[PDB]
Amino acid sequence: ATPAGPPPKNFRLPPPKNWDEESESTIDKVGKYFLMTEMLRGMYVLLEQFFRPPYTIYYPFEKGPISPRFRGEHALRRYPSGEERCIACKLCEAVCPAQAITIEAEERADGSRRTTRYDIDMTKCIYCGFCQESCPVDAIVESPNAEYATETREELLYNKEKLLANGDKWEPELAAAIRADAPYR
C-alpha cells in the first residue's frame, strides 16, 4: 500500500488528540454550534449570487457560440462552375464508423465519374466528421445547422437530392467555415 524501500518520512499519522487536548475555545466551539455559523456563511454566498448577472441566453433570439469546426447536418457542395464536386471515390463510405453512407456510381452521359445514389442515414450517423476529413475534393461537409428536428424518421433518410439541396442552401457558410479551418486541415 506504500512503495518498497523506506516508509515515507512521517507517513504515519500523529496519535489522536483527546477532546480536552483540542485547540478550540469552548466559547468559539459552543457558539458555532448554537448560532450555526458555517451554515450562515453559505446562505450569505447565495445572496452574493442573487445580485450578480445571470448566465442565461434567450433562445431562439440569441444563440450559443459555435466554432468553424462545428459538426452539424451534412451537405453536398459544388464548384464555382456548378458541377458537383463528388466523383464517387467512396472513401467516405469506407471510413464511416456507423456504415451510414450508401453510394452507387456509374458513368454519366458525358463520360464523367459521378454518383447515382448518395444516401446518408441521419439516424445511423454519429456526427464524427470523418466523412469530411477523408474527402479529396471537399465534396461532403457538415454545416453548422443543428436545428432540423423532424416529425417522421423517414425524413431522416437523406438522399442525394436533399444533400445537394442542402449544399446549395448553405454554401456561403460552408465556404466560410472551410476558409477558416483549411490551414489546420
Binding site: 448577472p53 445571470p54 441566453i57 434567450y58 431562439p60 433570439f61 440569441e62 444563440k63 450559443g64 457560440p65
Partner: protein, 66 residues
C-alpha cells in the same frame, strides 16, 4: 434584467416597442440594426451586453422558428 438597464432602454425604444419585446423575446433590449435576412429577420448588435447576448434577432414572423 435590472432597473438601470431596463429604464435606459425605455428611454431609447419607446413604450410601444417595449411591449412588442415583452411578447416575443421577454427582455428589454436595445442595439444597432446590422441587417435584414431575405426571410425578413432583423439583426442587432451591442458590445455592451452580457457575453453571448451581444447579437440577437427580431423575427419577421409571429410563429417564429430558429
Amino acid at each position: 434584467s435590472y432597473p438601470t438597464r431596463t429604464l435606459a432602454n425605455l428611454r431609447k425604444i419607446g413604450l410601444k416597442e417595449y411591449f412588442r419585446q415583452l411578447l416575443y423575446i421577454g427582455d428589454t433590449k436595445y442595439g444597432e440594426l446590422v441587417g435584414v435576412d431575405k426571410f425578413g429577420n432583423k439583426f442587432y448588435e451591442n458590445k455592451e451586453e452580457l457575453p453571448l447576448r451581444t447579437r440577437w434577432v427580431d423575427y419577421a414572423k409571429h410563429d417564429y422558428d430558429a
